[PDB]
Amino acid sequence: VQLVESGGGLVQAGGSLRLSCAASGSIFVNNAMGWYRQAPGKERELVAAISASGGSTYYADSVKGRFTISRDNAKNTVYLQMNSLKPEDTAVYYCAADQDGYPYEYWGQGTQVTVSSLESAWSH
């Protein structure tokens, strides 16, 4: 079972970025998938999760209304559309997919997202 995140990089505060994650090696349509992040110096946190059918979602309080999770079961992919990004959203983002039985969850290797503050928006 393997997961690979696509997308990442630098965005100016207020901007948007879409992350994707594709899974291989088993059936994923019957289990939840999601995204965690580890901001500098912080504990890793569950950012968003989505049920097998897509009919239920979960968001961390600090991203509600700004991030949207969705999935394409035919591609075994999960997406994180990040809008209204803020510098506090700077983190390594890890996709995850659940399965029945130990080890219960697989994690991707992570992708860096960096959101620049206004101090960098002009030369001074």
Author numbering: 2 to 125
From the article:
With the aim of achieving specificity in ligands selected for BCL11A, we produced ZnF23 and an “extended” zinc finger domain (exZnF23), which includes the C-terminal unstructured region that diverges in sequence between the two paralogs. The extended protein fragment, which is 69.3% identical to BCL11B (the ZnF23 fragment is 93.2% identical), was expressed in Escherichia coli and purified, and the recombinant protein was used in a screen of yeast surface display to identify synthetic Nbs binders. Of these, 2D9_V102G (hereafter referred to as 2D9) and 2D9_W108L were selected for additional studies because of their stability, high affinity, and specificity for exZnF23 of BCL11A. Nonetheless, the high-resolution structure of 2D9 combined with maturation mutagenesis data suggested that some of the interaction with BCL11A is mediated through a loop in Complementarity Determining Region (CDR) 3 of the Nb. Together, these data indicate that Nbs 2D9 and 2D9_W108L can distinguish BCL11A from BCL11B and target endogenous BCL11A with high specificity.
Although BCL11A is predicted to be largely unstructured, the protein contains several well-ordered regions, including a CCHC-type zinc finger domain (ZnF0) that might mediate self-association and six C2H2-type zinc finger domains (ZnF1, ZnF23, and ZnF456).
